[PDB]
Design a binder for this molecule. Structure first.
Ligand SMILES: Nc1ncnc2c1ncn2[C@@H]1O[C@H](COP(=O)(O)OP(=O)(O)O)[C@@H](O)[C@H]1O
Ligand SMILES: Nc1ncnc2c1ncn2[C@@H]1O[C@H](COP(=O)(O)OP(=O)(O)O)[C@@H](O)[C@H]1O
Ligand SMILES: Cc1cn([C@H]2C[C@H](O)[C@@H](COP(=O)(O)O)O2)c(=O)[nH]c1=O
Ligand SMILES: Cc1cn([C@H]2C[C@H](O)[C@@H](COP(=O)(O)O)O2)c(=O)[nH]c1=O
Lengths: 194, 193
């Protein structure tokens, strides 16, 4: 089964995805954990380009999708066939929120690309880690990571509209303390798997 | 203005595009020459991935477009704005013929990605270097390059259907000698330049 974490930078996805990976493993699931972009040899090369180079927004979209396509074909589809629980730190809603709502690229076009890269694989559940931008930015600032408030305000709202419009997205209050956040996530998952 | 060379591997695009670059530069044009994939620092990184890694055909398609998008935004659009003659070694028809006719990906979808990557930038003329697959292969074998005959037969045909279906495409008989081929290229261009 497929569990996707989504949300703005500094919402706790890395943290919570790893917490979930260890928890489910301990419970006897066979689990995989992948980040996007990245998660394959080729995707990681693309992730470094995306994080280090000055790119226009079109080229960026196409690289995010290329990384996803490699991950889907190389790892996610084979994992799912073997009944692994696949946990993703970011997936298709990040593309729509960042490239669409943030950068103003066309949302229907993005969805079509998403569908092409995924071969239509969709999550059983998406956990949206919702958090006020200013709180995310203080968390990131502690680790010397700076992100753009005006941009992230639009991205946050994108994610929240997607949570209303798209299937199987649960809005998590990610402003909580780590353990409380994790317990909300467990409650959200409780219907989809044991 | 924008001039694109298309065709199968070993049809002579590198050779003829550089010929044309030198010719036009001597005539006093300010000229650029770019290859696809590649042609920018980032595009060349992508080209090396495309040429060296084992990729599925969807990831390939997306990397070809990403290289094109970088080229268009970084180089082609500003070049055209300055009235350079921009010469491309491969462009959007290669994607359709290779990924579409060759690998069986959806051609409308390909075209939509092409339109996105290019911002609608189209060539003034495309020179399709048409050649029998056997001849191209022989040319390639002499430089220790080997390509797939079955695949390339489909791609060749794809390019020929597109020369019929698409606009501003001239079919060049690329089977001749270098100067004979350049001669037909100059004939086709005097329609446009
Ligand atoms: N619930 C929390 N409260 C406060 N800080 C947190 C919480 N969860 C994670 N952090 C810290 O906030 C920062 C961003 O968390 P991270 O998991 O990397 O977020 P993301 O992957 O969404 O950008 C990290 O320094 C992390 O240790
Ligand atoms: N008209 C020609 N006749 C015979 N060989 C040629 C001709 N044009 C080019 N070649 C040679 O064929 C090979 C492929 O040409 P190249 O320009 O690299 O093709 P492409 O870029 O279409 O793959 C090269 O070794 C080149 O020197
Ligand atoms: C997956 C994905 C991430 N991103 C951005 C969000 C982050 O700011 C960066 C990924 O970094 P992160 O690994 O720190 O979560 O990539 C997009 O803009 N679009 C996408 O499709
Ligand atoms: C531009 C382009 C090239 N290709 C292929 C054609 C060549 O076999 C390969 C390397 O190109 P080259 O030898 O002409 O430089 O890339 C595609 O499959 N799709 C495309 O969109």
């Amino acid at each position: 089964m497929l569990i996707a974490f989504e949300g703005i930078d500094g919402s706790g996805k890395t943290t919570q995805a790893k917490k979930l990976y260890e928890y489910l493993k301990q419970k006897g699931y066979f689990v995989s954990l992948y980040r996007e972009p990245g998660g394959t040899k080729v995707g990681e090369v693309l992730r470094e380009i995306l994080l280090t180079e000055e790119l226009d927004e079109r080229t960026e979209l196409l690289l995010f999708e290329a990384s996803r396509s490699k991950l889907i074909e190389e790892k996610i589809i084979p994992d799912l066939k073997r009944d692994k629980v696949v946990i993703l730190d970011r997936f298709v809603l990040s593309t729509i929120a960042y490239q669409g709502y943030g950068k103003g690229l066309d949302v229907e076009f993005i969805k079509n690309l998403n569908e092409f890269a995924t071969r239509g694989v969709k999550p059983d559940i998406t956990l949206l880690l919702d958090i006020p931008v200013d709180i995310a930015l203080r968390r990131l600032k502690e680790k010397n990571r700076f992100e753009n408030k005006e941009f992230l305000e639009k991205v946050r709202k994108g994610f929240l509209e997607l949570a209303k419009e798209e299937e199987n997205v649960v809005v998590i209050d990610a402003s909580g303390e780590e353990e409380e956040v994790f317990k909300e996530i467990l409650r959200a998952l409780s219907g989809v798997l044991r």
